[PDB]
A paper describes a structure:
Intracellular nucleotide binding, leucine-rich repeat (NLR) receptors are key components of plant innate immunity pathways. The integrated HMA domain in the sensor NLR Pik-1 directly binds the effector AVR-Pik. The Pikp NLR allele only responds to the effector variant AVR-PikD, but the Pikm allele responds to AVR-PikD, AVR-PikE, and AVR-PikA. Here, we graft an interface from Pikm onto Pikp by mutating two residues in Pikp (Asn261Lys, Lys262Glu), forming PikpNK-KE.
Author numbering:
A (entry chain B): 187 to 263
B (entry chain C): 31 to 113
Write the structure that this text describes.
């Protein structure tokens, strides 16, 4: 199935959010990316065979401290 | 105070274009204080970090959620409008 991955990223303002989202959208196998959550501090990534540990690594180095918060599969009936 | 889901504002969510639209909203609480909220599928399951512990959260066909939540924490579901 497609996976949905949610990552909390320390992101100072709307431009840092822009940059984390740009970095993820450029990642191998990302179908779609969105900024979500009550504090607009979570990146939600959808795709096939995304490497979540590679993605966390990239964010931690280039953007801010990152925590994996959800991994789920897209339901297809 | 019983968590009052009727008085919870919608989550800040995004219906991703390449996957089915998820039928449920979820709301995560610590000591009955809202921490965050989002969307999830009905009749399904997801792994979510709930405070100090990963939890395998199951949803029934009416978006009722169940899991082994750490003390003080819960995740509650509601059907989205039209579902």
């Amino acid at each position: 199935l497609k996976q949905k991955i949610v990552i909390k990223v320390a992101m100072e303002g709307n431009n840092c959010r822009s940059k984390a989202m740009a970095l993820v959208a450029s990642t191998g196998g990302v179908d779609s990316v969105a900024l979500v959550g009550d504090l607009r501090d979570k990146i939600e990534v959808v795709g096939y065979g995304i490497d979540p540990i590679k993605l966390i690594s990239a964010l931690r180095k280039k953007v801010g401290d990152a925590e994996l918060l959800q991994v789920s599969q897209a339901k297809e009936d | 105070r019983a968590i009052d889901l009727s008085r919870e504002r919608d989550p800040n969510f995004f219906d991703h274009p390449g996957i089915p639209v998820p039928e449920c909203f979820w709301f995560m609480f610590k000591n009955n204080v809202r921490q965050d909220a989002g969307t999830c599928y009905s009749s399904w399951k997801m792994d979510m970090k709930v405070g100090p512990n990963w939890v395998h959260i199951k949803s029934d066909d009416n978006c009722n959620l169940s899991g082994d939540f750490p003390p003080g924490w819960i995740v509650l579901g509601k059907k989205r409008p039209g579902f």
